[PDB]
Amino acid sequence: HAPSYRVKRMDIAKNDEECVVNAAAPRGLPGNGVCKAVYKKWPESFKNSATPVGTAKTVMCGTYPVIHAVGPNFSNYSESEGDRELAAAYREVAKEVTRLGVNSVAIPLLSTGVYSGGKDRLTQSLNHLFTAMDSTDADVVIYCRDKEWEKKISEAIQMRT
Ligand SMILES: [Cl-]
């Protein structure tokens, strides 16, 4: 037992962890990017998966848990309301990870990309991720796709040890 954070630049649908967090689209839809990859790999986990912005809902695919976390779309939310809902989504992820009793979890950065409102939200989203997941016992593996983001996430991980 020595919980860590790691970052990998690859498709989260190929993760090596005991459960996955989906950067879920609202309304339980297949979405794009990460959510679409999750839909292609674990389509059964989208049965009644819809959950409001700021929340998370776990649906099993077989016995593999998919934690659907709906971050805010900053094109629709103000900066202050969106920040609150982004923090809350990660808090509900940490609660689901705890309830599931998993030893590890694969997580993407919520409210980035098409939900970012055209702004770079790495630091904002990653810091809410740390605040929530620091409360758990699980190994956390953060998944990104951009090479400069991998570098920055790795630097943030390094300066917490
Ligand atoms: Cl990325």
UniProtKB/Swiss-Prot annotation:
Tell me the compartments it is located in.
Answer: Host cytoplasmic vesicle membrane
Give every Macro domain span. Answer: 2-161
Impact when changing V34 to E/F: Almost complete loss of mono-ADP-ribosylhydrolase activity
Swapping D11A leads to an effect described as: Partial loss of ADP-ribose 1'' phosphate phosphatase activity
PTMs? Phosphorylated by host on serines and threonines.
Query: What is known about its subunit structure?
Result: Interacts with mRNA-capping enzyme nsP1. Interacts (via C-terminus) with host G3BP1; this interaction inhibits the formation of host stress granules on viral mRNAs and the nsp3-G3BP1 complexes bind viral RNAs and probably orchestrate the assembly of viral replication complexes. Interacts (via C-terminus) with host G3BP2; this interaction inhibits the formation of host stress granules on viral mRNAs and the nsp3-G3BP2 complexes bind viral RNAs and probably orchestrate the assembly of viral replication complexes. Interacts (via C-terminus) with host NAP1L1.
Q: What is this protein called?
A: Non-structural protein 3
Tell me the organism: Chikungunya virus (strain S27-African prototype)
Shown stretch of the complete protein:
1334 to 1493 of 2474
